[PDB]
Amino acid sequence: KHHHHHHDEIISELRELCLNYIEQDERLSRQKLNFLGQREPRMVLIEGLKLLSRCIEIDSADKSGCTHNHDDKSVETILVESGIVCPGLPLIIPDGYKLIDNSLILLECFVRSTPASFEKKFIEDTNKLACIREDLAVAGVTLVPIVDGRCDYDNSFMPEWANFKFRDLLFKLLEYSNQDEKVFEESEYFRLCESLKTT
Amino acid sequence: HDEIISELRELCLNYIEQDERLSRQKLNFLGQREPRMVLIEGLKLLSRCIEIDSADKSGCTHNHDDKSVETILVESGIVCPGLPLIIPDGYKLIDNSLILLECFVRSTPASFEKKFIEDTNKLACIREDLAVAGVTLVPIVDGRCDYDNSFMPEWANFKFRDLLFKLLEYSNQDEKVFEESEYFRLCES
Numbered sequence: 203k204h205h206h207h208h209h210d211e212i213i214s215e216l217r218e219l220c221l222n223y224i225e226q227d228e229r230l231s232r233q234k235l236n237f238l239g240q241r242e243p244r245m246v247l248i249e250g251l252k253l254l255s256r257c258i259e260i261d262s263a264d265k266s267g268c269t270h271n272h273d274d275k276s277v278e279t280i281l282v283e284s285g286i287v288c289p290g291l292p293l294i295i296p297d298g299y300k301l302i303d304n305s306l307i308l309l310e311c312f313v314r315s316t317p318a319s320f321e322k323k324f325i326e327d328t329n330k331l332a333c334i335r336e337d338l339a340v341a342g343v344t345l346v347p348i349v350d351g352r353c354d355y356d357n358s359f360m361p362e363w364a365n366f367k368f369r370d371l372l373f374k375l376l377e378y379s380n381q382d383e384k385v386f387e388e389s390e391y392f393r394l395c396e397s398l399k400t401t
Numbered sequence: 402h403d404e405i406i407s408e409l410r411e412l413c414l415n416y417i418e419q420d421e422r423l424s425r426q427k428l429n430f431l432g433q434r435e436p437r438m439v440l441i442e443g444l445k446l447l448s449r450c451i452e453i454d455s456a457d458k459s460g461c462t463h464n465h466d467d468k469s470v471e472t473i474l475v476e477s478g479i480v481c482p483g484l485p486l487i488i489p490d491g492y493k494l495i496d497n498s499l500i501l502l503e504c505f506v507r508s509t510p511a512s513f514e515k516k517f518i519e520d521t522n523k524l525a526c527i528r529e530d531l532a533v534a535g536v537t538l539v540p541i542v543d544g545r546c547d548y549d550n551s552f553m554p555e556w557a558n559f560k561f562r563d564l565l566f567k568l569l570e571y572s573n574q575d576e577k578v579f580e581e582s583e584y585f586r587l588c589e590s
């Protein structure tokens with residue numbers, strides 16, 4: 203009834219935003235539910251950040267004409283599920299993928315907030331996909347690699363204002379959580395932990 | 402994780418002697434599902450074992466219900482207003498002497514000495530208040546260097562701690578992914 207705007211209300215507002223202002227796309231159902239079920243501040247924070255990330259990844263997949271990698275399949279798994287074997291193959295989990303004929307589109311997306319880190323991340327993700335172009339070619343597959351670098355957190359599943367307010371509340375939860383942890387590290391419980399070093 | 406919590410519960414149930422003073426904290430421990438809470442209640446359960454041994458060795462009543470000093474006195478008909486809020490690991494009123502006990506575990510000499518002085522000061526700060534009310538404080542500080550206790554076999558005490566430590570390890574390893582991952586950038590953004 204009376205809003206005092208402390209951490210429990212911060213968590214409750216994040217849940218309202220999640221429920222009522224993030225589009226009801228079925229690919230988001232599992233992470234929304236994961237988020238809504240968290241009770242510990244640090245865990246609300248973490249799954250909240252992951253929910254936001256998932257909105258951006260799926261947004262990228264849709265705009266890039268790719269299938270979003272819902273279950274975090276590896277490239278090997280994606281291949282093996284279509285009857286194609288590539289056995290010497292490093293671990294790569296793409297944000298998106300699409301096998302058309304003999305062509306395998308693979309998508310990496312990211313958000314960076316400065317030009318220097320934008321460019322650095324773009325190079326890293328590009329090299330990441332490139333290093334398996336040859337193996338795929340051996341197995342008869344043409345790699346079509348896509349790196350979608352973004353400069354902000356905008357996405358089609360949340361209105362701009364809600365996206366901003368969701369991030370704003372996550373930041374306030376982070377501040378609370380950090381203070382909660384500092385207070386914990388001054389408690390006897392933390393001392394008893396330290397002592398558990400007996401092992 | 403489930404296996405870890407499941408192993409911890411079996412130890413709690415089968416290899417901690419059934420002294421009834423431990424029953425409540427065992428039940429508190431057994432109802433925890435969340436890792437951070439399992440760890441805290443597990444450490445409290447080990448602490449209760451040590452405290453009860455200490456009380457039994459000091460001719461004191463273990464403070465099972467977390468009574469305050471103020472409460473302990475009232476129950477014996479003694480009124481002492483203004484007392485700061487202190488909850489002792491143990492107590493006993495004999496004649497006009499109130500034995501108060503503080504127990505602790507520390508695993509280095511440096512941390513041992515620091516805690517010993519802290520609990521000593523903690524009790525000392527109400528000596529005058531009690532004397533005004535006609536009560537002589539008998540303050541006991543009992544420092545332990547490990548979690549050894551009369552309620553558990555040494556092998557079970559070690560396994561219990563080993564499991565709690567693995568829980569703590571997993572949590573530190575998790576927070577090192579929130580540290581190095583895309584979700585970190587977002588949070589520091």
Ligand SMILES: O=C(O)/C(O)=C/C(=O)C1(Cc2ccc(Cl)cc2)CCN(Cc2ccccc2)CC1
Binds near residue numbers: 390444486490506
């Ligand atoms: O450092 C210690 O050895 C120690 O015995 C600590 C405690 O008893 C407190 C923490 C605690 C430690 C162990 C257990 Cl089993 C339960 C609680 C903290 C001090 N107290 C804090 C407090 C003060 C006033 C009112 C309530 C709580 C009580 C709980």
Ligand SMILES: [Cl-]
Binds near residue numbers: 267300
């Ligand atoms: Cl498609």
Ligand SMILES: [Cl-]
Binds near residue numbers: 366
């Ligand atoms: Cl804005």
Ligand SMILES: [Mn+2]
Binds near residue numbers: 488489490
């Ligand atoms: Mn205590």
Ligand SMILES: [Mn+2]
Binds near residue numbers: 490503504
């Ligand atoms: Mn104590």
Ligand code: NA
Binds near residue numbers: 267
């Ligand atoms: Na499409």
Ligand code: NA
Binds near residue numbers: 366
């Ligand atoms: Na805005």
